[PDB]
Every structure is written in C-alpha cells, then in structure tokens.
Amino acid sequence: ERAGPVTWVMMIACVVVFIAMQILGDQEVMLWLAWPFDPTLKFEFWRYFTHALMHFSLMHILFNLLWWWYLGGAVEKRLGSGKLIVITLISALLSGYVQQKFSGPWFGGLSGVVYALMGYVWLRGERDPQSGIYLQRGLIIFALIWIVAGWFDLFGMSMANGAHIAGLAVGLAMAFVDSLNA
Amino acid sequence: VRMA
C-alpha cells in the first residue's frame, strides 16, 4: 500500500461528496459546501476548504484523484502526513480565495491542491535532491500538458483559472521555503 | 460552475 491516512481520507471524502452530488444534485451539495456565497455564510469555516471536495464531472474527479494519489502520496510517505495536511489546507484556502475573487463563489475541485502538489514536488526535487521527493521528467511533461489544457480551456467545461495559478504559486512558495534548509 |  502506498496511501497514507491522509492521502486515503481525502480520496474517500471526495468520493462520498461526489456520490452526494449524483444523488442530491450539484446545486444541493454546492449550497452546503461552496465558498461563502452570502454574508450570512461567512462564519461557516468549513467552506473556505470544502469547495476542494466537490467534483462536477467524472474526468474531473478521476484526474484530480490520480494526481493526488501520486504526488500527495509521494509527499506523505517521504515527508509525513502533516506536510501534506498543510500544503492541502493552504492550497485549498488560497486557491479558493483567488478563484472567488476573479469569478465569484461557484467553483469546486481538488485541482487547486493538485497544482500546489505538482509545483511543490517539482521545485523541491530541483533544489533538494534529499527528501528525495522528485517529479520524474515524463511526469513534468504530463503536468505541463495538464496546466496548458486548463489555461486554454481544452476540456469543454470551464476552469477555475484563479484557483490553478494560486494553487501552483503556493506549491512553489512552499517548496522554496522548504528547500532553503539543509 | 468552474472546475478546479
């Protein structure tokens, strides 16, 4: 097995939520989990994070969880459960913030966090051959194409571009901070 | 909606 607790609970949580959305409908689940979309929702703290848990298409959940399982799982095994927790909380909160800024609160997906993990695993392999956390050359290629497809909207349901940029930024910023060690 |  190569799923730590944290890699695993996140996969589970995303699956459960995705089931909820097929059963109750997307809007119904958004209503409960979306970034605050009204002044009356601002103290509902779970919302600054739980938008990460919602997926809108089968290809969305599947690609997000494939990358999570892999990079997230690499990060947990080599660097520990708490590092992945903090990349995750920070990426989710910060991507959510920039996404709603540009485009308002109706958005969801783990891909702000996947982008943080991509940028993080890459830049920390490059400035620290010693976690050994690294992003394998073939996988930098598959990651770049992924990045590109979002930016130029190559998927055919439209994309949380704020959340993507913010996500990657946070992952770079943290790899930077982390590698600047010994 | 927008997908992240």
Residues present in chain A in total:
182
Chain B residue nearest residue A113, CA to CA: B4
Contacting residues of A for B4, CB less than 8 Å apart:
51-52, 95, 99, 107-112, 159-160, 163-164, 167
The Cα–Cα gap between A151 and A35 comes to 22
Sign of the alpha-carbon dihedral angle for A42, A43, A48, A50: negative
Which ranges of chain A does DSSP label H, i.e. alpha helix?
Answer: 5-23, 26-33, 47-50, 58-67, 73-79, 81-103, 111-126, 137-151, 161-179
What resolution in angstroms does the PDB record give?
Answer: 2.3
Q: b or e along A114-147 (b: 16 or more beta carbons within 10 Å of the residue's beta carbon)? A: bbbbbbbbbbbbeebeebebbbeeebbeebeebe
CA distance B4 to chain A (A): 4
Nearest CA to A163 among A21, A33, A35? A35
Contacting residues of B for A157, CB less than 8 Å apart:
1, 3
CB-CB: which of A26, A57, A160 is closest to B4? A160
Sign of the alpha-carbon dihedral angle for A121, A122, A126, A132: positive
The Cα–Cα gap between A129 and A180 comes to 12
Indicate which technique resolved this structure.
X-ray
CB-CB: which of A26, A30, A163 is closest to B4? A163
Tokens 């913010």 map to which residue?
A166
Sign of the alpha-carbon dihedral angle for A83, A84, A85, A87: positive
- Does residue A60 have an active-site annotation? no
Residue A13 CB contacts under 8 Å (≥ 6 apart), including other chains: A53
Specify the CATH number for the domain of residue A131.
1.20.1540.10
Chain B residue nearest residue A151, CA to CA: B4
Question: At CA A30, angle to CA A28 and CA A32, rounded to 5?
Answer: 80
Q: Do A159 and B1 touch (CB under 8 A)?
A: no
Residue A113 CB contacts under 8 Å (≥ 6 apart), including other chains: A52, A68, A87, A88, A91, A92, A95, A167
Q: b or e along A71-109 (b: 16 or more beta carbons within 10 Å of the residue's beta carbon)? A: bbbbbbbebeeebbeebbebbbbbbbebbbeebebbbbb
The Cα–Cα gap between A57 and A143 comes to 20
Report in angstroms the alpha-carbon separations of B2 from A27, A104, A105, A136. 13, 10, 9, 29
Nearest CA to A164 among A86, A133, A172, A156? A172
Domain coverage including residue A176: 1-182
Total number of domains in chain A: 1
